[PDB]
Amino acid sequence: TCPFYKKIPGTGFTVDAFQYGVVEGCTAYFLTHFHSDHYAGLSKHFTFPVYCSEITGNLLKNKLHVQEQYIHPLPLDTECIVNGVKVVLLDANHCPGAVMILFYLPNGTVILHTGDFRADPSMERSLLADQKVHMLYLDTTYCSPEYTFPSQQEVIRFAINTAFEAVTLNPHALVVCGTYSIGKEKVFLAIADVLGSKVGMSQEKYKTLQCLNIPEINSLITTDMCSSLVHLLPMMQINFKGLQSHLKKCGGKYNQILAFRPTGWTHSNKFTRIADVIPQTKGNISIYGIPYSEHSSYLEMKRFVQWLKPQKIIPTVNVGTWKSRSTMEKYFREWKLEAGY
Numbered sequence: 001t002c003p004f005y006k007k008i009p010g011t012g013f014t015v016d017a018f019q020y021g022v023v024e025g026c027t028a029y030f031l032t033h034f035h036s037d038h039y040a041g042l043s044k045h046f047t048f049p050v051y052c053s054e055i056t057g058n059l060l061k062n063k064l065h066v067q068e069q070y071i072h073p074l075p076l077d078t079e080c081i082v083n084g085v086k087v088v089l090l091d092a093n094h095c096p097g098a099v100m101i102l103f104y105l106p107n108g109t110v111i112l113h114t115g116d117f118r119a120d121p122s123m124e125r126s127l128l129a130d131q132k133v134h135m136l137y138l139d140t141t142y143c144s145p146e147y148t149f150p151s152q153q154e155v156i157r158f159a160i161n162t163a164f165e166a167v168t169l170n171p172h173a174l175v176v177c178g179t180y181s182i183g184k185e186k187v188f189l190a191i192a193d194v195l196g197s198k199v200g201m202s203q204e205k206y207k208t209l210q211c212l213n214i215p216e217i218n219s220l221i222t223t224d225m226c227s228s229l230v231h232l233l234p235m236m237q238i239n240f241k242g243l244q245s246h247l248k249k250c251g252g253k254y255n256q257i258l259a260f261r262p263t264g265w266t267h268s269n270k271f272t273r274i275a276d277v278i279p280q281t282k283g284n285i286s287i288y289g290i291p292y293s294e295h296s297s298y299l300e301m302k303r304f305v306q307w308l309k310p311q312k313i314i315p316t317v318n319v320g321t322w323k324s325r326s327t328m329e330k331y332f333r334e335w336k337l338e339a340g341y
């Protein structure tokens, strides 16, 4: 049965609700982004209207074989009308194609659903600036003050500098980057760019990336692993055994692996700046865990909400324990008292 925080009141709409069969009273299903926890249940047999971004639509058609007639892509930053309700899709600064949704209800209520997001001050100058929001359904993934992390830019600078130095010192080193879903493409693309290489990957992963419009993609990615010194592997293979084996598969082209595991958060951020990060090493294999997040830090989230000043906040993450729920509600109270709303 569909939870309440996936239902938009005063509409026949749901958000990221495909794993519950036919939702009672749902006339249109919105999908914020192409991550499995959100799309789970879509397939070729789906025959209700799905509203999403252009990129998300491309992925629905090609990867899941959803039929074209049921896919309704909307342009960003554009007032559109769905079953008589004005809607706008806004960039969520999450993975490619990820959106937030603004709903303008017939009675005058305005609702923002963030989907998954990484709050940024650039959002303070989109269509949000111009009006009040009565209800915010908020991505609360990292809603606690221990979750502090660097900017994506600082993390990429660290990665590029590390990889460039390693391959310069040993031209026979291979760089590996882990992946488990779309998102975090900048990690591997920025590395390949500095080394003068393409990123080699499986045919299935190549086809996924080709679905995303990213300009100059024929230009940065390939299925020819032999001609590439940056390889993309499943995140599960980013460990000493998986990587020893990969190295075996390369037929003596390389004698060393430097691997990156972009993670959300790790407790080393509580004690260590980006510049201080060091690898785990075993033989000729080093693994760096880097804090590349596509979700708001605590402070990013706090600033977004104190700017927006919603009348009611509905959390969409960490809602399953009484202790988590209580903790988040206590922060929301603080934020409201400090900002004067």
Ligand code: NI
Pocket: 033, 035, 094, 116
């Ligand atoms: Ni996500």
